[PDB]
Amino acid sequence: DLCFTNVYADSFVIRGDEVRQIAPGQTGKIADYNYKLPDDFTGCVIAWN
Amino acid sequence: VFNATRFASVYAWNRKRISNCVADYSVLYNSASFSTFKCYGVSPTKLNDLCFTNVYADSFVIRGDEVRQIAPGQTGKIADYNYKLPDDFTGCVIAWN
Amino acid sequence: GAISSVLNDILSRLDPPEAEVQIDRLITGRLQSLQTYVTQQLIRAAEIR
Amino acid sequence: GAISSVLNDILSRLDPPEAEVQIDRLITGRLQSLQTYVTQQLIRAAEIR
Incomplete structure (x- = not known):
């Protein structure tokens, strides 16, 4: 839904x-x-085995 | 405390007094020893920077x-x-396998 | 409501992510105190006027 | 803004680590109401004075 500028x-x-x-x-x-990671970082973290 | 051969049970947990000594916890970050390490009332890296009274x-x-x-x-x-642990407990919790 | 009332102790104890939380609680309480102080002082000043 | 507005209820349902947070929220709100009430009381006090 929310579109970002640069990912x-x-x-x-x-x-x-x-x-x-x-x-x-x-x-x-x-x-x-x-x-x-920045303290005020805005994003997501993904991990898998 | 950390490297003792045998810790006591949680039922009868050893009562250790640490005083009149230099507390250096950089060993934890200077060598991979413990898997779990966290601090609640203080910072893990500022333990050496800040000096306490009765640890x-x-x-x-x-x-x-x-x-x-x-x-x-x-x-x-x-x-x-x-x-x-007290609700207002100030300290760190350490655990390892 | 913080762990301590001294900002130096907070800075020397907690990492940033929790340091800002403690300092924010201190600011909230202390700013409420100063807000009430200024409101009471304004009322007293109106009475003096 | 808390989960409940009753102190006995908040003690009963929640554990102390989160019960204290909810009680802090409720305390902040109830105080804030007190400072409201007292400031309008002082303002009516000035006008009636």
């Missing part, structure tokens, strides 16, 4: 247990050091 | 499904009987 997709693979830490404001190895 | 540790072992109910105000078979 950018970031594809990456992490530990199985690190998925729960991938979100705005979350903490963790990847989240804090390698790949961090 | 206290609580060691116990519970079932995996019982970990989710270990938090301030939580209720369940473990929270309300053997070990519980």
Whole structure:
């Protein structure tokens, strides 16, 4: 329903247990050091096995 | 506290006093040891930056499904009987396999 | 209603995502206090006028 | 804005971690009503003075 201006997709693979830490404001190895999400980030997170 | 050979049961959880020592928790982020690590009243990365007065540790072992109910105000078979956290509890919760 | 009444403690304790929540609760309460203060002061000033 | 307007009810149905949040919402609203009432009371006080 809501149409966006520019959509950018970031594809990456992490530990199985690190998925729960991938979100705005979350903490963790990847989240804090390698790949961090903006606190005010507006978007979606998708993961599958 | 962390690397002790055998923790005590949640029924009788060890009462540990940590004082007159330097608290360095960068080891958790300096080496992959624990799968689960979270903080509620403080930041996981600011524990070393901010210095406390009387830091206290609580060691116990519970079932995996019982970990989710270990938090301030939580209720369940473990929270309300053997070990519980104050609603205004200020601290961190650590768990690993 | 916050964990502490000092903004320095909040900044030194919680990460941003929770730091803004605590600071927002503090702002809400303290701004209500100041709003009531100014309204009472305006009423008192009207009486003085 | 809370789930219920009764303190006994909110204590009974919800656990304390969320019960305290709902009670905080209700407390904020009931106070806000108090500050309303007192400000219009002071305004009628000024006019009647």
